[PDB]
Amino acid sequence: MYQLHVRVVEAKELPKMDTFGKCDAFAILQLNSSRNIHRTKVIEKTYTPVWNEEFHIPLEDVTIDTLTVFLKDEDKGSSDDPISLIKIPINQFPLGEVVDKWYSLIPVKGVKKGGQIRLTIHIAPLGATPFQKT
């Protein structure tokens, strides 16, 4: 059994998602199509949010699982404003290695640019120290 440790560090180059504001960005992580969703806090009115939030996701398959990362703009009614997403196959992360990288997000219809998001990702055996080389 293995754990997917993900630090959602920061994002930049976000689009303007509010006509008279900037962007109220938060990220959502989803392994495969799981109902167990994880989300960051919102950083209000910035194009360069820094969250530095950590999540720990049990893996079903260290090669076939996929991590989907969604970026959204929190809005003032009952719904939020999708920005972009990226689909990250997990097989590219060597087992036990901590990988810190930027990812170009794919914007949704009607959004000019998707931004970039920095993620630190570590596939580690259950019980090993998260975000430390195994």
CB of 75 to Ca ion, least distance (A): 4
d(CA 24, CA 42) in angstroms, rounded, equals 6
Shortest separation between residue 57's beta carbon and Ca ion, angstroms: 27
Which residues are within 8 A (CB) of 69 and not within 5 positions of it... i.e. 6 or more apart?
Answer: 8, 27, 28, 29, 85, 86, 88, 103, 105, 117, 119
Are 3 and 124 contacting, i.e. CB atoms less than 8 angstroms apart?
A: yes
Q: Which is nearer to Ca ion, 20 or 33 (CB)?
A: 20
- Which region, judged by CB under 5 A, interacts with Ca ion, from 13-21, 60-68, 98-106, 125-133? 13-21
Smallest separation (angstroms) from Ca ion to the CB of 79: 10
Measured in degrees and rounded to the nearest 5, phi and psi for residue 8 equal -90, 105
Cβ proximity to Ca ion, 117 vs 123, nearer residue: 117
Q: Quick one: tokens of 55?
A: 């999540």
77/127 with CB nearer Ca ion: 77
What single letter denotes the amino acid at residue 14? Answer: L
| Cβ at position 14, least distance to Ca ion in Å | 11
Site for Ca ion in 70-129 (CB under 5 A): 73, 75, 81
Summarize as ranges the residues that interact with Ca ion (CB under 5 A). Answer: 17-18, 24, 73, 75, 81
